[PDB]
Paper text:
According to the topology within the icosahedron, the hexons can be divided into three types, peripentonal (P), edge (E), and center (C), which are quasi-equivalent in structure. Superposition of the 12 Gn/Gc heterodimers within an asymmetric unit (ASU) shows that the conformations of the ectodomains are quite consistent while the TM regions display noticeably different orientations. The assembly of penton and hexon peplomers are mainly mediated by interactions in the ectodomains which form an ordered contacting network to stabilize the icosahedral glycoprotein shell. Across the entire glycoprotein lattice, there are four types of inter-peplomer interactions underpinning the assembly of SFTSV viral particle. Exemplified by the penton-hexon interface, the outer sheet of Gc domain III in the penton adheres to the end loops of the Ig-like domain C of hexon Gn, which is the most prevalent interactions between individual peplomers. This interface involves both polar and non-polar residues, and the highly conserved glycans on residue N914 may also contribute to the interactions.
The severe fever with thrombocytopenia syndrome virus (SFTSV) is a tick-borne human-infecting bunyavirus, which utilizes two envelope glycoproteins, Gn and Gc, to enter host cells. The viral genome encodes a membrane protein precursor that undergoes proteolytic maturation to produce two glycoproteins Gn (the N-terminal half) and Gc (the C-terminal half) embedded in the viral envelope.
Residue numbers in the entry:
A (entry chain E): 358 to 476, 480 to 510
B (entry chain J): 561 to 1069
C (entry chain I): 818 to 868
D (entry chain K): 767 to 817
Write the structure that this text describes.
């Protein structure tokens, strides 16, 4: 499920490199049954495994194999593969619930906004500073008139 | 496998003749350019002749793109020991009156030393003084001439191969297949000729990637035990004592023996010490595991993970995390080659059988095409969106190729033509979408990563919300109405439940 | 490119060898390789260099 | 372990043969020497020291 596994019967594994369709990996530990993985969900479809390496005492080995990998398996929860994939739907009962929750949130937001739309506002706040500026101009004109009278 | 990135740069550029009687060619010369491809792809080079309907192609296979360096020089550094001998004699004549060398005589060999051998090696004809008297071996109050000769040996015979380099330019492997049928491999460099074979001079180009801590590194390797290590090595013959760069020689056969005529040493590599007619020699040569910054086969200095890739002409590699380099295009030049053309193509017609793959992604979508004809390989598929060329065999067989599509529901009509005959094909199937894979612990990159498609990154309203309701031609409205009614019913139910909960919370406190 | 008329100073072609190969690499750059390489239509500054 | 020294810069191991007397004092170098300190008229062997 995780990846491919290399089995050695002659001797231990010194170093080896595996190849895939569009990916490559290399790992070595020194045991008989070694496991080598590429990524999470990188091999999806029909591909051929081409392993090439050399064992101890200067002995090289080459093998070819084609393994059956699952195609319709996404296994995502909070990534971009959720909002873009709808054909396989590995977890069914989900899109209906998501759309229902979105509709509920939209209706709740609309109901909360209507309470303010129908019923302490800018149209009351602005006349305050407007009349303040008017009173400032009136005081300036009064000072100018006093200066003119002097 | 599949093919892409067609060029067709020098079509109809032949000056041939009747061609041995029925149909032959002479030479084709031009110049083209191949763009960068993902590791594990094929770049076909389809030629076009004015007389022949179709021609063969030239596939380029790339497997790994490792970070190697050039080869500034090559030499072998053998292991040496301390060997020396001396002789105690008396004056007894006028040969040892005052000193051993009168003014400049360095030939301190009176046809008695063992220096005239093939296994002796490098040495320095030096001399010193000894003791005199009845206890030292003489019978006259006069100094005695005592000569000494030292050299180096190699009992074991360990051979080392060092190759200094300070460039570290990107490189890759190319498995080229000629249209005639010959398949060979070679390792091109980033601007260095790759030993042009029958005119083909395909080279690789990089991007001059900087290094973090790669200033003084080499690729010293061992032959017997096949042990590799990363450590700063020396330079050419003009070197300094104190680090790597001890007594070397010219060839590998000159490494087992440390004899002259090929071995080079500057000075001060073996010392001499004596107290009383002893002339003992001590060793100052350091082994390979003695200098600083001596790494091993697994090296993780910086972001690069230097591994040991099994490959000819080089055993040094390394691959960091996904880099997604800018460009890795090639440059192919032709000088002279022959290619046979049939020009006897007959009626051929194929069809599509299967279709599958990813979305517009790395591996693409593979489509199986079946053909049937008498000619060996005369086919050229051309369609919108992507162009793919491949080779077939005689008779009826099955072939699988990959194309690039930009739509989930691939339902179009492409044109297929083999040789001179043409036909029409159709594709119908369902595709999926795969993004860039994520990193997992325990896994390390092997060669490199080319590119990952992450352009759109947005949900498409056409593909999304498709299998939720259904498919038809007038049932979509009914489905939308039913879903809306169910949503309104569930909304009313949830509102009633919330009102009941608030009523229960308010009273009965 | 024969002698008696052709002039070159030094260090215009490199040599590399590993095992009785003596391969040579190219360092000569073409005309479209240096900086500030213009074309037939040139509008550098107020001058419009035509042909 | 290459242990460092505190004040050991110019020291020697001059020893006497007849009386077997030892002393620590800075001595001279090879034949090319300077007059003013130890390093006076020397010779090659021990028998060449009596004369
Ligand atoms: C070893 O590497 C370090 C860091 O790059 C450097 O400072 C040091 O000089 C190196 N040592 C030698 C002997 O080159
Ligand atoms: C086409 O049909 C299925 C579809 O995937 C495939 O498994 C099968 O191998 C193909 N047919 C042949 C003859 O290869
Ligand atoms: C076609 O292929 C067969 C078998 O590979 C070979 O014997 C024959 O010569 C080929 N013909 C041409 C024209 O290439
Ligand atoms: C190109 O022109 C600019 C501005 O005139 C100058 O700074 C630069 O040095 C030039 N480049 C070369 C290679 O001469």
């Amino acid at each position: 499920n995780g990846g491919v596994r290399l089995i050695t019967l002659t001797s231990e594994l010194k170093s080896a490199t595996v190849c895939a369709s569009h990916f490559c990996s290399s790992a070595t530990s020194g045991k008989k049954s070694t496991e080598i993985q590429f990524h999470s969900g990188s091999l999806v479809g029909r591909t051929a495994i081409h392993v090439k390496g050399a064992l101890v005492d200067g002995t090289e080995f080459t093998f070819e194999g084609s393994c059956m990998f699952p195609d319709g398996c996404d296994a995502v929860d909070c990534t971009f593969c959720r909002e873009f994939l709808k054909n396989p739907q590995c977890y069914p009962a989900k899109k209906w619930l998501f759309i229902i929750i979105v509709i509920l949130l939209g209706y709740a937001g609309l109901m909360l906004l209507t309470n303010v739309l129908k019923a302490w506002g800018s149209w009351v706040i602005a006349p305050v500073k407007l009349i303040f500026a008017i009173i400032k101009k009136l005081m300036r004109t009064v000072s100018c008139l006093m200066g003119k009278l002097m | 496998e599949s093919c892409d990135e067609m060029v067709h740069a020098d079509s109809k550029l032949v000056s041939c003749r009747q061609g041995s009687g029925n149909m032959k060619e002479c030479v084709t010369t031009g110049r083209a350019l191949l763009p960068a491809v993902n590791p594990g792809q094929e770049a076909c080079l389809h030629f076009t002749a004015p007389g022949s309907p179709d021609s063969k192609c030239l596939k380029i296979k790339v497997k790994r793109i490792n970070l190697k360096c050039k080869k500034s020089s090559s030499y072998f550094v053998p292991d040496a020991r301390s060997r020396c001998t001396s002789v105690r004699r008396c004056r007894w004549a006028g040969d040892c009156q005052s000193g051993c060398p009168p003014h400049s005589t360095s030939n301190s060999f009176s046809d008695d030393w063992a220096g005239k051998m093939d296994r002796a090696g490098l040495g320095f004809s030096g001399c010193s003084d000894g003791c005199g008297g009845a206890a030292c071996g003489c019978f006259n109050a006069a100094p005695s001439c005592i000569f000494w000769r030292k050299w180096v040996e190699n009992p074991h015979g360990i051979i080392w191969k060092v190759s200094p380099c300070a460039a570290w330019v990107p490189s890759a492997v190319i498995e080229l297949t000629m249209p005639s049928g010959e398949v060979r491999t070679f390792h091109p460099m980033s601007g260095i000729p790759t030993q042009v074979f029958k005119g083909v001079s395909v080279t690789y180009l990089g991007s001059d990637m900087e290094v973090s801590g790669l200033t003084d590194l080499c690729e010293i390797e061992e032959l017997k035990s096949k042990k590799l290590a990363l450590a700063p090595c020396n330079q050419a013959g003009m070197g300094v004592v104190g680090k790597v760069g001890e007594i070397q020689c010219s060839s590998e056969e000159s490494a087992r023996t440390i004899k002259k005529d090929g071995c080079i040493w500057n000075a001060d590599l073996v010392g001499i010490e004596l107290r009383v007619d002893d002339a003992v020699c001590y060793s100052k040569i350091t082994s390979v595991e003695a200098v600083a910054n001596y790494s091993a086969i697994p090296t993780t200095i910086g972001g690069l993970r230097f591994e040991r890739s099994h490959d000819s002409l080089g055993k040094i590699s390394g691959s960091p995390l996904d880099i997604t380099a800018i460009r890795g295009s090639f440059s192919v030049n032709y000088r002279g080659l022959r290619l046979s053309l049939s020009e006897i193509t007959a009626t051929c017609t194929g069809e599509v059988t299967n279709v599958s793959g990813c979305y517009s992604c790395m591996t693409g979508a593979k489509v199986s095409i079946k053909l049937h004809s008498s000619k060996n390989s005369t086919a050229h598929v051309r369609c919108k969106g992507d162009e793919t060329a491949f080779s077939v065999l005689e008779g009826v067989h099955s072939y699988t190729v990959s194309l690039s599509f930009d739509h989930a529901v691939v339902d179009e009509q492409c044109q297929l033509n083999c040789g001179g005959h043409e036909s029409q094909v159709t594709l119908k199937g369902n595709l999926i979408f795969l993004d860039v894979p994520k990193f997992v612990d325990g896994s390390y990159m092997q060669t490199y990563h080319s590119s990952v498609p992450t352009g759109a990154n947005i949900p498409s309203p056409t593909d999304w919300l498709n299998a939720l309701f259904g498919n038809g031609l007038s049932r979509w409205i009914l489905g939308v109405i039913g879903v809306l009614l169910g949503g309104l019913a569930l909304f009313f139910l949830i509102m009633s439940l919330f009102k009941l909960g608030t009523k229960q919370v308010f009273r009965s406190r």
